[model samples]
Target chain A: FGPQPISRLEQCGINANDVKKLEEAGFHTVEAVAYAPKKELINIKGISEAKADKILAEAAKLVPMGFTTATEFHQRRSEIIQITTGSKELDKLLQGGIETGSITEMFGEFRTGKTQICHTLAVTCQLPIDRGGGEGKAMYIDTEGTFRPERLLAVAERYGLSGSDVLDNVAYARAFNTDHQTQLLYQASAMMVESRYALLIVDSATALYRTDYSGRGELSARQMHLARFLRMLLRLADEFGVAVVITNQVVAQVDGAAMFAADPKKPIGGNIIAHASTTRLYLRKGRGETRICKIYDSPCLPEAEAMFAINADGVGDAKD
Target chain B: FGPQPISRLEQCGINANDVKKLEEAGFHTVEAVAYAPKKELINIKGISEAKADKILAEAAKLVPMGFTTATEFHQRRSEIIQITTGSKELDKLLQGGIETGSITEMFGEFRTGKTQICHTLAVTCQLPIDRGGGEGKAMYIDTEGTFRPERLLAVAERYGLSGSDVLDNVAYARAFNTDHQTQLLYQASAMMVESRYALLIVDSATALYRTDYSGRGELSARQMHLARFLRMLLRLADEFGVAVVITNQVVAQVDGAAMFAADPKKPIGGNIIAHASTTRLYLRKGRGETRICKIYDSPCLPEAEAMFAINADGVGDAKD
Candidate 1:
């Protein structure tokens, strides 16, 4: 029911020696073979361009591929349940709520309730599936030191759930570096099968990549890894039907000749991070204590904004 | 190859008399039967609750239904070719450009280059398929009397195509009223099958709907018709792989207690229009002659802005 195994390559007529070479080259799954660059596959020991092409074609067949009619796609879309953001107005802006089987990105400057939304989702995800929740555990991967048990407790109390129960259900991991972050995703992939997890939260997905790699010299490497990390999240979301949420930080546009010069602040990580996210929200501080949440990008949703406030009960609709 | 026919209902075990009753009730096609309200179908003569359920179930089988793996969905997405927006930067904001098989809505105040982009697309869509063009003719439905042949001539000339040749390929229609606008879609549907059309432009999709319906009392009816109109566009897009572009007008948000109070300008038609579009672009006048095009919503694109100009040649990247 999950990702196709590397052993399936045997059915594709790949010899044992070729499979061993593929594993040695870090291609351990059928998806790896399907997505790997042809050049990279040929570079593997004992593999030629023709063999690489054949391997990719066979791998593609093992992985799900091809088209479905609109009616069929619509039925699949209906299975994508949404997790409410606790605020009715915010949920309305998000159509129904944060959709499963896709990555929802929230990007903003500091103190704009990015972590607050994560905490709220961590608690709200424990609700029953019919009640807009996934009836599953929440997994939070903190890269920015924003994990707070007290915040989750406060939010869980608002939902009338036990604080310890909520805290226990949420699996937390602190990603110390870029390598650790990548490893954690693999670790979470294994854990996902072991536990019933509906929500996977990556608080500030770009912090490690942004900090470890600086300046134009390292930009290429940073983005490459960032794209790889995002692809892993996407794979998990699709395979497990999990709602993946990630937070991103914004960078002020310093170039005067930029196209969108009027809007100086843009989300960091550039196009790689932008394209990976299925839904993107831009949050900013507006009026006193109110956070303006804008639907920046979504496949099915519209461009709209909602106002929500962070209080003792967590994120809620802002009062007039 | 195409949608199912109503005659196929006989294969679903429904008698000819029952099919005739369905046709009398406006269920003239399998799509109509599939999408009709269950109660409405039951109201048809010789249709009991059990019979209605069975008929709908059979109709549903003739249509595609159920889930598709992400891999399969991805393959279908690749079939969605992008039509260039004429401006390089604008194309980047749209990932590649406006996508076929989906509704792309561009909304803004008057003279924000909304109609200008439409004209540019009309000419560019006639370009060869290898040149990022749709390689087919365009269909433009003008609702606000904004479409100009000279503008199309200017853009066509820029593309190095004969202005007369380009004009001949683009079929233009002026919709005088809301009913006419709705009727034009049906006419366009019939015309679409007769000719190979790649682009469908509904310039100002809501001007008549907005003007004819006034105040809060008529909002429901206005939105209902608007939704039905959009559904037809969606069906055409999915069936024929046509790129549907619609221009929308924006209204000033005067209410102080509004959710997005910080930004007073709101696009008309509310959620009904918002949810119908697969991609939404917000166009506004920028500094001097530059037009700001921000991607407000897109299933696959990012939230980014581009600057372009409506020049003598066509809509192109703004000169510094």
Candidate 2:
């Protein structure tokens, strides 16, 4: 009767503690929240744009006459941790959060923080909402031998989550070849669909294809296969309402009208990857404590770059 | 009378020597050049993608059926440049030579070769049409001091033009402040409209504002001015039928829910610049002797990145 906020909050994966806080703050009626001033709400302890937007959206659904005309209405669907401690700016780049029911692909050079972000997400997902954590579980599929449990535990420990709780939520799978990778994706997706996994993370989406299909002039074939594999991952995420994050490798267009130079600093992905993801973000290392997040594709987010820091207590600010 | 090929070529500033080559190549018929296949036509001895598409587009206007559709035929409204010095790949990236009649913005961090590319275009605009040059006069407006007469000379030497001749064709304006810069732009645009400069290059479009408006919370004001300036430039480019190329600097956003510390490495310009440019290209330093041209904005072009190098002869593939 109270605008069914519990179900709405549950849909957005917001913890009961936060909902209690909002209610205590006199945000009981849906009208109170639907018409709440954004600045006043942000000033409320522990509320961010992403969270405030979610609460407001849920409140609108309670009223027959409200700002229901908003196109990007936050459905308050499940939340998925992309990369444990990967980036805060990156998560913001994905307005609705790397989209729960879609495939998010990140392809760049050797060490563009691809795997690091993935690891961070695994841990961050286990943290509580008040502390900027989603308190959700993640599934990690590694293909490049880059998956490290120690890193995950370290990220989780920094965020006050027990190492085992963080590790337990993540179902790890190792696939060495394209076929193996594809098979693991299918198996893991099936498991994720049935279980309560919030995110399905593929450390390297194109590792096998890049290696097996190397130098055969079968790039089109490789891309076609990639397209299909991505399509499957897309369906799994959408159908089961989970987040699917994939990492890809960079390639050089040596003898063609190159749109970008193959600078290890700047990674390359063809139009296929560009068109597939709902939101595309670029990560690059910076001097000292700074890191950069380039917004390549995001309908709602502005096309620009933002900087952040790397630290021990999961990815938050550079100050930590 | 013979479908405006002669005038269309003239509008793009093609000289007699280049015109003769285009004539001999069986592209003499206005309809033929207008309807030329983009990929195949660009491979012709002198045509570049930017120029080829424009020529075909312009020629299509002369045909009874028009360029896009027979019933919806339009006229060649603007002068254009065909940067033929670079490899076929580099040329296509510009979409028929930096596209005459609109303001084009190229943005990147330091050492992205924005000026070097501009210098290349300066010389390329001087070449005859058959040699892939549009044989047009260029106006160079340098705010960042990246423009070098020596560099222009080197590119000119490669294209077999006297350094002095190419330099003479380019009217150089050194703008030291934002006020001077705006006035210079207005003046240059007036000259372009009155006379017939096919290419107008603004090297570092927003550099003066970035420098002068430092730290006074004047970023929005500067950007707003830039938006207005670019709007005027766009209008002039369209009205007078001239190509406008502008370069901008990079800045990072500070506060927001933008996922900082997560996936970093983004570019500047929040939304105004993002939506302004007719075509936006992000240039970044790449691997050995390579630069990446990532097509950040364009309706027709897919999200793509191309690799090219800046040498004495101008922008081309690594080898050439």
Candidate 3:
């Protein structure tokens, strides 16, 4: 996907102050403004139904909307690209690789290689698109303080890219809390419009939400925010056609009965996370050094599993 | 959680023919109509936005919606009852037991005790409310040919309830296809309102969907139908406060990578199924005569596992 001008919001008649209000309300860009529901826009303090409609009209000019035939939709699907996960087997299981224009949720218990995949995507996404890369920069939002330049160096070196250049190409941010995490999306949206961003990684999407919101009492509010955050991510994916991958931590499924002898741990954030993800892959520990990646959910992929390993060069085909 | 009259649809000014049209569009009951998006209802032929809004208003009066303070919500939580799985360990894992007002999905491979649990619930749901049962009838929608009268009889006999009487209380329907399966929910809504239905069981919810819809191209249609079916179940659970227990089948996670050395088979239906069920349980065969039940997902429950058995008496305590 080519870049759309960042000034589209201003061109849509949203002044600097109005832009700030939109940002505060989590409408970061003109694309978000365009796609927002009329009711939601009316909920903003300074925006009325008429004003919302005006903003939407201008925003829609910058972006295409309305119904398209299946042929056009299919043609757009062909335009979408995929980024390799550094493992041929894993890539095949993902039906070529992590696809753009959708959010892929990778979740599992610790050391299941969720972060490893993130680092690999950061490196691989910069390779030429023909090589299963986006040939663009990567944006990583680390909510758990897990981003490491050293790991990026290892992965970039394996791909024969300059480590420093690879690191520089990745826009890194450490999110301190839920609100901060949400704000980072606005910043991310601005950055995406300024440059070619092939991949967006949120390492552990639910860390702050799970820690901050405890018990059933806060569940609704927590889920509402979580849902909004995910919707924003989905919009970004659609607007810029970037491959979005968000890692999630697993919580023990302690409700007495399980569907299988498989481990009982499930990804956190419940249905909100589950529904938001366009594709979901469950990662888990396997035989020594080998990790299993199961296609938990996908629109175009079969329910399949693949084996990979977390090596010094990031995720790759398991040797054993 | 008490009954509201099913005739409220007519009271909401929906004519008989309109009700049939609504059912054809899958808006089976008044609650379903009320909770549906207004735009969707307006899409029905001859139904205007004004008509949809009026119906929604009248339906909303009959059913409560929006803005419940925490105290009231907490009181509603207390009203949620659970159905015991017979094993104390299983019950403990599920907090008290299978809870009302939520959909609980149990999935596993063949002979993994998925059906056994359904049979046990079919018997135990008739127990006194104070004794962890719904103190009401059970509805079984069997998509597969797995439903056996003999199994229900064995479980009822163990519970000291007459086999035929227990069977009589259970309204059974064999679903031959996806459309028939979906239509059963409408019939289920009618039966639930006429009598007390504490539990609604769909023994293997995904078999027909899985068989009928294959390949990536058909995935969207399959999931959309699955999601609609699930939303209907959720409405039934929320409106009537029935415990919905749906059994799902598992497919081999054959992509070669697994997060654990554990069994690689996962439940079918991907994210739609994953997100729809409020609570998810994984069942598998354990040691001889014993079955393993692990809580895979729950909102308020902790991560835990429980062991039980399926003997001649149906699901109960395993002989040590």
Candidate 4:
């Protein structure tokens, strides 16, 4: 996968005799061999690791290597798109909607409507930029299998988009296991490269690890893999500037474990999840058909609760 | 990776001329090439697809294929092991604890002590048959990463077993995502074949499908994949004779959705999960430090409630 000509390597100091040998060995493009393993080339009748190394070094000089800076990072984040969560009031809680170039985590109990918000986000993110949207696609990796596209159709019509188009734009994959879950991220990266994705959602990120790792004896392994997965999430955020949203489930513990800051039910995954998420919302059930979201954690936003309704149209203003 | 000698294919129907081509292509065992793709056999200079097909058909006769009758199935199931849940009351509720050769699912919300019961079973399953265990190892696929060996140590100590040895016998894996959660089953099959495992625990079985597949539009895909995964779970139960224990989380829906067969919070994944599980328990909290489990659904059991306590040592009878 390269553009620079192989003959260009000769001017960079590769020999004519070696050039024929390189082609016979299937090193046509500079990258075909430049990024190749030396063992692969040494299989040629007259090539050495040293010669392969020299070829790689010269080819690398031609192929671009990525490098960006604090200001470049600053500029990218400055241009970040705040994809609507579908609830304008909820978006106001975070000063906008979910922001790109960062990870946002929302955790709560069963009836708190985390998946509903995700459902709306999938539809809303596909809206035109003028309508509080990123005007790009959404990628959802469902861990809990709760995703309902029919709900998306309802939310889609509300936003003036064809539900069929919205469903197509919302790429989906059912993660069968944790390895597949982690592997899907790599797969997601490839799609993100090919498509203009505005939002990447992993509903209930910590779901599988709870059953797979099991207990204190295996927490270390769980933590390592979690960190690895989160690291990828973070990298994808920075690289693609894709707004990332992940939902988490909670646990209730008694006592003055004000570790929750106040509530008895604490989000799962503890400090690792807390640190990974750039913005964290603690969701809880409100009165009839309503859900309350508080800024349980965030960098610049004040802790505040936003009331949102789980209307038939999907996540919407509590006032309505 | 095979047994029946390559020459043995001749007796079944092969000619000696084609045998040399098969051998030269590295088909040393009848199984080696017999089970291989026709494309691979045809890669040999002299072998044609027709010849490869003929050679494979003849070689297949020498390899063993498995088959068992309904009576055989009934006999294997009759000799099922009853692994203790570490709570006599819970055992009574279950009629005799979780049984092998079938899938048992327990569903509840957090703090319901679903995982605690799992921890105790990991130790209890390793107990001698007289103590109501299968006297074998445990295979745990932790989806939530909630498994704690330290908890096992406590549970093991209470059951009079060495925690370190108990840890060794507990085969653990932390599923990163739903795909990993599903893939772990195939991986579990390989391990269960190598070791004498009595229990296979997938705590929170339906965690990832919630996020992986979205909306009613995608429900068809989700249900199809969910059915595929549960099919594997069923097949494993029949073949391994290992007791399969899976846990599901509940969702709160307002309605007479009396669909729950009562409670507002119903188990996720609905009928597909219900049909796959031979026995189903609905778990919830009880009076201080105690949890209640009801036989929400079962093929052959009274609708009953068993109270269990979450002690520092692990799941125990509520009477304690």
Candidate 5:
């Protein structure tokens, strides 16, 4: 939903110098071209009237012609792919499962079971379609280095798959800095081309932001960079139809203002994270091995909470 | 979507031999994994229950987590781009303009201007966003070796872009056989990565099908192969978000007895092309200096006719 560069227009075989002038003429997007009459759009200086008509048509060709009938929408919506959260309660809370066509964000202030879900999904997403699985591979971008082959194997054991095989199924990458983390996306996309990945987990998407850009002094640059990173992640989801999950760390009230209730928390990346996530989940530890997951925001699902338990076997309904 | 291979599941690092069993054990696709209960999905022989839990989750991870909320669908559909066709009547007939996220097919009986439109779009697609261009480069997969840089340059001349500049922006490939035609997509995709393309033209997508697989003897295999090729084309649209136009040839009813009217032309590639194309257009000769384009079928656009003109330069509105 951001203003993507007008680069796609250049791909139509338009010239570079002309595009610069086209930029200031109030046509920053292809939609802009369609919005104007050929006569009006042709008034731009230095370009011939003849070029205007073709450019007008070409721009209209690339812009989305809104007024999509649901049949048309349905035709496209069939594209949404969901992977189960492994817990009926969690699936119910998510309205079927974790969607693959956009970014999903989960933040917790423990083994509150988010990581468990990642490992669980990592192994589970490969299930064949009829089994409520993506039947694709998993790509895990490890920021905390906390990813354990043992844990994945542990989950795979419950699924009747091999630890070695499941580990192989899930491609892992360790990100040292924001630059590397951002760069790894291209690498992931490249690997994705060779193999289908049902899930891509940036287990702690916000971790490197702290070390790379400290505090409000560099906040703007940091926030923009974060936004850029999330957009790329979303593109991966859109392009590959893969489930993208980015973990965010939350700051429980520590000399912080109240009003958000006990242990008031704010997830890292602020509005950037808040907006990009198609689904946002807030995780909290419950007493006696219970982890409570609340739907913070989603387009359709009600803001509701579900209880899940994480034992050695991975995420499932909380025991009564 | 046809049953995509379990290759993606293998990408998850699943063991080869185990996946072989998983394939026949009713886990051919990832969606199958999510459909069954862990108890049942785990019952497949040769795989341990320990592995079941993880594999269950992994398969669940990759499947199309369906039940998409329209909001979710809209978010993804916003990714679609449209490029103009340089003719308002044609654009109106097609509804806004040529769309980028899927294939659009145009078949004609004459110089009804399909080729001219392709040439016009090659130059026009490079116009900046506000000019109704995709602001991207053009890739022409030329069959019959009919692509003329002179024609492209002619269109560019109208736009005031140097022929050399526009020529550099367009990537042309001459495909001699089915294998080479299919292979060009990979080559096109690689080029797409380096620069954005507003339009991809497979000028006469079915020309090589006749030579590659002829008559009733090889029809099934040919159709299947064409289907495979089209699926890849759709993937390219999905991945690159580029507008795709594949010119198709028409066969005027000669000795053919049919329920249809005179000159009830049959398009090459039949049902395969019919199903694969998001929009279908039929072009015919019109009055002096006029070319008629009819919307044969579309998801939203009414089946209607529009008139345009083609002359020494390229495509435009019918001369009043």
Candidate 6:
């Protein structure tokens, strides 16, 4: 095999010639740009204000592409495929744990444990993949003021992981609306791709979107915008290879022959959401001392699902 | 193109000579053998017990394939897309309505309107597509007892649709457990594929999966099984050309940094469900009279999404 590493990139349409141009400009490794001053890039001949800005922007963007160098790019791509943490059970269920390459959504009615899972996964990802963990850093984007550091410390303690250390490994940010959430996702996706964080969790993806848009008349515009947003999430997942997680809410149907359909249990998003997730699950209250985990849709598994409970020690199979 | 019409034997892989023999014995369309009593098939000349049973079973399976004749098979295969109905706002967010041959997931916490959206779709499917409706039949696999005809009728009336007519177009069934839910999907999928339903709705896809298997530590097993179930749903959507809508629940997480997390609104089956869905949405309550619809994940949507309320008349921009 002629340079085994080059094999995959060939199909991706990137080649050795691209690397030569950078090397001649004294940008030998990708890391060089990570720390390079923007002003210095302008010194290069023929680099106009617009052209220089564009180059720098593209360079910054490449950081997430893991393109420090051809060799590193190849290595990082493989690493991205393996990034995950949380529970091995979760990892396997997710096809290798919070996939770094796609946006994962979790929605339900209130108090159904959406945040709890995010917390657990944040800590779980610190362990190495071989040990059923991602052993990578976690970056959380909070939109509903739900991120809690104290809670993470407690969960870390339960797992016998250093609470402080685990906390240090996590990067947290708060977004107040759709605009901010988008900014964070864009920037974080870039960072995660370059930094190779094991997990990227969005506590609730809809917090800002729902707030910014409204009513029947805006339906077409809202969906068009929503479609654009969805496309971005997919690109980040594939481009960066990080696990993406989001939470949502529910609604009740009050019309029709199917009106008896009031099951006071599940959340809502309607058909738009139903078409997005690779696997869909539901959580609900069971008899005392129990919680239910329902399987809605999955590509590789059968119907029906498992259940777990939230405890001081974190989530595990429900115990009597 | 050459013959006016081909025979049933030509549609299936059955031997024409054998079909001729069966025809002489009173078997014509595959349905003939499909509905035949077992004893009757066993008594046929030149048909041993094993061979007769095999033929009968095969014929039975083929009967629902919508391919009794060659022309029928061609017709069924040629028609691959199915539309699904939804509230005006939801339909708009979904770009007119849910496209045929796709799986969409809606998830959130309890009472976030998961079932309501499903109900709305049941009624909307009866309206013409140009009116932002499906004008087609609907199939509901209810796992949480939310398929109420009265509710559908009420919503239909609100939207100026024929209440009784819309109700008549919906094929509803109650699924009590995981097995039952999966079975419902299979059966309904077969019907939608062979018949003319435009939508298939699973109210709380994770409801049964979570409840039935709780108190057990087989979460991985649950996810694996659910993955398979999701695959089947996907296949049905693709093979039959219909829209599949699934509802899920949400939970809270107590452990983690950031003091709190947005808490995914979608419930269980974990990562598998996250990966399988084509589009994922999170629904949560906004202030009074408004509901939030966020895009959790999609192939090409923005990172954050928003939509207004979902009511009896259907989803619309958030009203004041």
Cα error, candidate 3, residue A111 (Å): 14
lDDT scores in order = 0.72, 0.59, 0.71, 0.69, 0.68, 0.58
lDDT of 5 by residue, B266-311 (tens): 3332332323576778889855666788887554444588888886
In model 1, the fraction of reference contacts reproduced equals 0.00
Error of 1 at A17 (Å): 51
lDDT of 2 by residue, A1-320 (tens): 11233335556667887777776564543444565668868888977899888777766665555356344355433324333344555556555345555656665544356666777776676666555555567777765544446566677677666766556566665553465566565556434434465677786665555334533355676666777777667656654556677875543333122322233333323546545666666676656656777776666668877666644444565554
lDDT of 2 by residue, B82-174 (tens): 455365676776566566655567877667788878888787877887887667788888887766688888777776788777888888889
Native-referenced DockQ of model 1:
0.01
Residue B302 displacement (Å), model 5: 1.0
Error of 2 at B154 (Å): 1.6
In model 5, what is the error at residue B49, expressed in angstroms?
15
Query: Chain B, candidate 4: TM?
Result: 0.73
Clashes of each: 1, 49, 23, 64, 97, 157
Chain B TM-scores across candidates: 0.80, 0.68, 0.86, 0.73, 0.75, 0.69
Best by TM-score: 3
DockQ of each: 0.01, 0.01, 0.01, 0.03, 0.01, 0.01
- If scored against the real structure, what TM-score would every candidate get? 0.50, 0.38, 0.51, 0.46, 0.42, 0.40
lDDT of 4 at A41: 79
RMSD in Å for all candidates: 21.5, 22.4, 15.9, 18.6, 29.1, 22.3
User: Which is better, 4 or 5, measured by TM-score?
Assistant: 4
lDDT of 6 by residue, B290-318 (tens): 67787775433334555666655655456
Model 5 whole-model lDDT (C-alpha atoms): 0.68
Two-way lDDT contest, 3 vs 6, winner: 3
lDDT (Cα, tens digit) per residue for candidate 6, span A218-244: 455545555556655655554444576
- Specify the poorest-scoring 10-residue window by lDDT in model 3 chain A: A255-264
